[PDB]
Design a protein around this ligand. Structure first.
Ligand SMILES: OC[C@H]1O[C@H](O[C@H]2[C@H](O)[C@@H](O)[C@@H](O[C@H]3[C@H](O)[C@@H](O)[C@@H](O[C@H]4[C@H](O)[C@@H](O)[C@@H](O[C@H]5[C@H](O)[C@@H](O)[C@@H](O[C@H]6[C@H](O)[C@@H](O)[C@@H](O[C@H]7[C@H](O)[C@@H](O)[C@@H](O)O[C@@H]7CO)O[C@@H]6CO)O[C@@H]5CO)O[C@@H]4CO)O[C@@H]3CO)O[C@@H]2CO)[C@H](O)[C@@H](O)[C@@H]1O
Ligand SMILES: OC[C@H]1O[C@H](O[C@H]2[C@H](O)[C@@H](O)[C@@H](O[C@H]3[C@H](O)[C@@H](O)[C@@H](O[C@H]4[C@H](O)[C@@H](O)[C@@H](O)O[C@@H]4CO)O[C@@H]3CO)O[C@@H]2CO)[C@H](O)[C@@H](O)[C@@H]1O
Ligand SMILES: OC[C@H]1O[C@H](O[C@H]2[C@H](O)[C@@H](O)[C@@H](O[C@H]3[C@H](O)[C@@H](O)[C@@H](O[C@H]4[C@H](O)[C@@H](O)[C@@H](O)O[C@@H]4CO)O[C@@H]3CO)O[C@@H]2CO)[C@H](O)[C@@H](O)[C@@H]1O
Ligand SMILES: OC[C@H]1O[C@H](O[C@H]2[C@H](O)[C@@H](O)[C@@H](O[C@H]3[C@H](O)[C@@H](O)[C@@H](O[C@H]4[C@H](O)[C@@H](O)[C@@H](O)O[C@@H]4CO)O[C@@H]3CO)O[C@@H]2CO)[C@H](O)[C@@H](O)[C@@H]1O
Ligand SMILES: OC[C@H]1O[C@H](O[C@H]2[C@H](O)[C@@H](O)[C@@H](O[C@H]3[C@H](O)[C@@H](O)[C@@H](O)O[C@@H]3CO)O[C@@H]2CO)[C@H](O)[C@@H](O)[C@@H]1O
Ligand SMILES: OC[C@H]1O[C@H](O[C@H]2[C@H](O)[C@@H](O)[C@@H](O[C@H]3[C@H](O)[C@@H](O)[C@@H](O)O[C@@H]3CO)O[C@@H]2CO)[C@H](O)[C@@H](O)[C@@H]1O
Ligand SMILES: [Mg+2]
Ligand SMILES: [Mg+2]
Ligand SMILES: [Mg+2]
Length: 755
């Protein structure tokens, strides 16, 4: 480029910056092409072009001006890249602001979509504010290749589509530009099928939706509604290995954490809306907005000391009672809680408070509702046509045709959409088995094998591996968590090693062993010591997340306190012992709302949590227990740096089944960060109980779950204990401890203590 062209950009004299900024073809070679990417980045000192799908990164050079950059790259196609932009000591990674010079679909967009590889398809499909032929308006586009006709119906034309019939392109996608309408427009697509039957559809790529049970899509100017402040969080994420950090997740269903009064409006970020009543049966209550949740949930979480909030599905879903697991509006956060920008504010405020956001994401199925994706164009479009692989009959839902390019593209781009537009830090996928097996919940003679004779759902396995490959390339440092309950191997291992590419898997076996164990009367736990120790045998085959989830405190399973045997003191003590053990056992942590304060009743998705219990001491004390435990977990490197390496854990002894006692070491990089953990899983205290330790010195009591401030009886070792030169558990030193009842001790050698 010339200096004159540069200066025209710098001084805002150029007639159209898209002619020189962004990605431009310089020449075609025999097997490759030569491209240039240019950027004007005021205040940046340096920039790079990242091609994350090819695993490449190229520096950009300043050209004529220190903030004007060019980068010349040879590659057959340059569809997928990001700009890394350094301003002083800070780096951000963004998409190229000059990537798309028109709102309409190009030939290239249609080709990439037809092949399933348009990672940014949601920039063109759906509804977008823009300018065509010199006039501002909205461009709509929808994939419906077998429809006979499609029109746009909405508020602007009183729901009559005759003067807004769309144009079909390349036998696949319908489009229309509508002048002089903008964000806030309410609409649907009116589709006529090959039979001549006419029906109404919500926008599959819609960005906002009326409040259930109304289903019209609403236009959002999604890049001009919210100003983020989380660059430093995102930079630290991208540069960190979350597997080596503390990950303590508070799992939350937004509709049922806390309700407000329906006698007032729902406040929004600088505005308000009518209340959304929780149900016809509880008409005095309304949901809290994303804005109100940012003001209340976030400081509550921060004060408890969790690192992450995990949300039950917030994608738009028509029925409260699915808990969000039956989604129909994949590209929009549910309007129950307000607007897209209110959810953006929630996430930005999490990041300001040093809290990450994980979204439950639901790629496995979708319900039959007529506004949604089902039979979209008068054919089986999103779902597979054969019910043996296209329906989950026990659930009444439809299964995406993962092999169909544009379907795969809908879902792959959807995952990326949440990280791009809403800055989230991770996803969790429920019931992964439901996608992986062609015989899932199907009887003999009601399913068919894959092409090689097996039960593996090949197309699903390939989709999952693609999701995870792309997610980690585009957004390094995120969490991708699976629950897979069969024995599928390598779930949380890299795709290059034959894995599915998640980085964490819920340890459902551990969960069952623990909750079954603790439900046993303590005298009988001696016959089930193996529940305590078993999960450590297979532990190193995956990266495990230890989750005690929402699913465990419904349908007659009781809440945590009610699972435990004995009187009220023992029930609390069991909950403290279990969770202290969970937090010291190797693996990341997840627990569900209500568990941190000892709610007695089961989670009820139709009300909110029993917050009035926090007026009473035993609940307050358990909440303080969790507050202090989370603080300890973040303060002790041996609880999180080496979760997934042999070095991080070793049993000291687990042979004392008749007293239900176990003990072990946790380790980190520094040997002085080593911890000794001792567990007593009956209410019988022990007074001179020997435990082997590897070195001399004073072992400080960092934590004792029987402390009186946690509701315990206040037995313990009075702050710490000197080890004896008395060999035990095959170690050269030993501690002579008092083991409090139904309690866990965490001890740490202080090598500077004065004898
Ligand atoms: O995570 C929450 C929280 O946990 C820790 O803090 C807890 C403790 O774990 C818990 O034990 C307790 O400690 C408090 C304590 O209640 C306060 O009274 C005070 O303790 C004083 C003590 O009162 C003084 O007398 C003095 O004790 C001497 C002791 O007099 C002397 O006899 C000897 O004791 C040895 C004893 O003779 C042996 O028999 C044996 O005693 C055992 C028994 O065998 C057993 O059956 C049972 O009863 O328990 C006894 C205790 O183990 O061993 C004894 C040696 O340990 O030597 C001691 C040494 O002084 O001194 C202490 C120190 O001031 O303060 C402690 C410490 O705060 O409550 C706290 C809070 O709930 C954790 O330390 C804290 O950071 C965490 O927040
Ligand atoms: O103009 C009349 C023509 O239209 C008719 O063909 C249609 C089909 O009915 C549509 O359903 C569609 O077919 C696409 C399909 O939508 C798309 O996903 C892709 O199919 C891939 C698939 O993703 C992949 O998994 C694998 O199985 O291979 C498939 C084949 O490539 O492409 C399909 C074929 O284009 O669109 C066409 C055109 O609208 C009619 O049947 C034609 O005979 C007729 O010419
Ligand atoms: O010096 C006092 C005693 O210290 C030790 O007693 C221990 C018990 O061994 C532990 O099991 C525990 O006791 C719990 C008990 O397990 C639990 O059932 C509950 O019992 C209460 C009950 O809440 C209450 O309503 C009423 O009925 O009285 C019962 C009192 O026992 O709560 C107890 C704790 O409060 O902890 C105690 C105290 O550390 C030691 O073993 C005893 O020999 C000694 O007497
Ligand atoms: O007054 C009662 C006694 O109290 C003290 O003994 C304690 C020990 O200090 C504790 O460690 C524990 O003992 C366990 C032991 O930790 C555990 O390994 C298991 O021992 C098995 C052993 O693993 C196996 O290899 C073989 O040698 O048999 C051992 C004996 O079974 O089980 C032990 C308990 O049964 O608890 C005891 C108290 O019961 C103090 O040290 C004693 O001297 C004192 O008398
Ligand atoms: O103020 C009058 C009226 O406004 C609201 O109704 C809107 C719907 O919520 C919205 O879905 C849309 O309804 C259209 C359907 O979506 C569409 O499928 C088709 O069947 O036509 C409908 C309009 O006829 O528009 C209406 C009207 O704006 C509010 O929710 C109503 O209850 C209220 O009475
Ligand atoms: O070093 C090998 C192995 O040692 C440790 O494993 C112990 C388990 O942690 C524990 O449950 C127990 O295993 C038995 C099962 O509980 C029982 O149900 C059945 O399958 O037999 C098992 C075989 O013994 O004891 C084992 C062996 O000590 C440690 O936890 C592992 O990580 C480690 O690899
Ligand atoms: Mg399940
Ligand atoms: Mg068993
Ligand atoms: Mg309530």
């Amino acid at each position: 480029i010339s200096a004159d062209q540069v200066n025209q950009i710098i001084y805002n004299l150029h007639h159209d910056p898209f002619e020189i900024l962004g990605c431009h073809l310089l020449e075609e070679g025999k097997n490759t092409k030569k491209w240039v990417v240019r950027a004007y980045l005021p205040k940046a000192e340096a920039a790079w072009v990242i091609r994350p799908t090819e695993r490449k990164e190229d520096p950009m050079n300043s050209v004529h001006h220190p903030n004007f950059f060019e980068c010349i790259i040879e590659t057959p196609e340059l569809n997928h890249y990001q700009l890394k932009v350094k301003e002083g000591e800070h780096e951000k990674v963004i998409y190229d602001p000059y990537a798309f010079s028109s709102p309409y679909l190009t030939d290239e967009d249609i080709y990439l979509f037809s092949e399933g590889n348009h990672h940014r398809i949601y920039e063109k499909l759906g509804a977008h504010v823009g300018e065509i032929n010199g006039v501002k308006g909205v461009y709509f586009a929808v994939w419906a290749p077998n429809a006979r006709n499609v029109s746009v119906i909405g508020d602007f034309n009183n729901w009559d589509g005759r003067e807004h019939q769309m144009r079909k392109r390349n036998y696949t996608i319908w489009e229309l530009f509508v002048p002089e309408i903008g964000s806030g427009t309410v609409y649907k697509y009116e589709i006529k099928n090959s039979e001549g039957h006419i029906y109404e559809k919500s926008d599959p790529y819609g960005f906002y939706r009326e409040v259930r049970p109304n289903t019209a899509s609403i236009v959002v100017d999604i890049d001009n509604i919210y100003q983020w402040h989380d660059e430093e969080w995102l930079e630290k994420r991208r540069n960190s290995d979350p597997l080596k950090q503390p990950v303590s997740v508070y799992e939350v269903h937004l509709g049922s954490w806390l309700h407000g009064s329906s006698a007032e409006k729902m406040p929004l970020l600088n505005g308000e809306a009518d209340p959304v009543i929780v149900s016809e049966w509880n008409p005095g209550a309304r949901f809290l907005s994303y804005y109100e949740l940012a003001e209340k949930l976030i400081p509550y979480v921060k004060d408890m000391g969790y690192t992450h909030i995990e949300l039950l599905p917030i994608a738009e879903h028509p029925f409260d009672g699915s808990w969000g697991y039956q989604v129909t509006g994949f590209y929009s956060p549910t309007s129950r809680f307000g607007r897209p920008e209110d959810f953006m504010y929630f996430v930005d405020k999490c990041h300001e408070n040093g809290i990450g956001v994980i979204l439950d994401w639901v790629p496995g199925h979708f319900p039959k509702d007529s506004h949604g994706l089902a039979y979209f164009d008068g054919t089986h479009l999103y779902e597979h046509a054969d019910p043996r692989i296209g329906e989950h009959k026990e659930w009444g839902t439809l299964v995406f045709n993962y092999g169909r390019h544009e379907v795969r593209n809908f879902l792959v781009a959807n995952v990326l959409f949440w990280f791009d537009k809403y800055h989230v830090d991770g996803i969790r996928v429920d019931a992964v088995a439901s996608m992986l097996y062609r015989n899932y919940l199907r009887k003999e003679g009601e399913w068919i094998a894959n092409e090689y004779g097996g039960d593996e759902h090949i197309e699903a396995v390939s989709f999952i591996r693609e999701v995870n490959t792309l997610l980690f390339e585009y957004f390094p440092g995120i969490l991708s968590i699976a629950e897979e309950s069969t024995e599928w191997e390598k779930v949380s291992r890299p795709v290059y090693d034959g894995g599915l590419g998640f980085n964490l898997k819920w340890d459902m076996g551990w969960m069952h062993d623990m909750l079954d164990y603790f439900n046993i009367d303590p005298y009988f736990r001696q016959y089930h010591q193996n529940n305590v120790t078993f999960s450590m045998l297979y532990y190193y085959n995956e990266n495990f997340m230890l989750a005690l989830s929402h699913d465990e405190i419904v349908h007659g399973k009781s809440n945590m306190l009610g699972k435990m045997p004995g009187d009220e003191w023992q029930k609390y003590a069991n909950v403290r012992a279990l969770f202290t053990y969970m937090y010291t056992h190797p693996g990341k942590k997840t627990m569900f709302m209500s568990m941190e304060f000892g709610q007695w009743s089961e989670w009820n998705v139709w009300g909110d949590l029993e917050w009035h219990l926090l007026q009473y001491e035993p609940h307050q004390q358990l909440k303080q227990f969790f507050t202090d435990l989370n603080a300890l977990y973040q303060q002790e490197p041996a609880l999180y740096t080496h979760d997934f390496e042999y070095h991080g854990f070793e049993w000291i002894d687990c042979n004392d089944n008749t007293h239900s006692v176990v003990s072990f070491l946790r380790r980190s990089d520094d040997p002085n960060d080593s911890l000794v953990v001792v567990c007593n899983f009956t209410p019988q205290p022990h007074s001179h109980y020997r435990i082997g330790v590897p070195e001399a010195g004073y072992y400080v009591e960092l934590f004792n779950s029987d402390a009186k401030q946690y509701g315990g009886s206040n037995m313990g070792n009075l702050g710490g204990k000197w080890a004896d030169e008395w060999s035990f558990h095959n170690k050269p030193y030993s501690l002579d401890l008092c083991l409090p009842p139904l309690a866990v001790l965490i001890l740490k050698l202080d090598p500077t203590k004065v004898p």
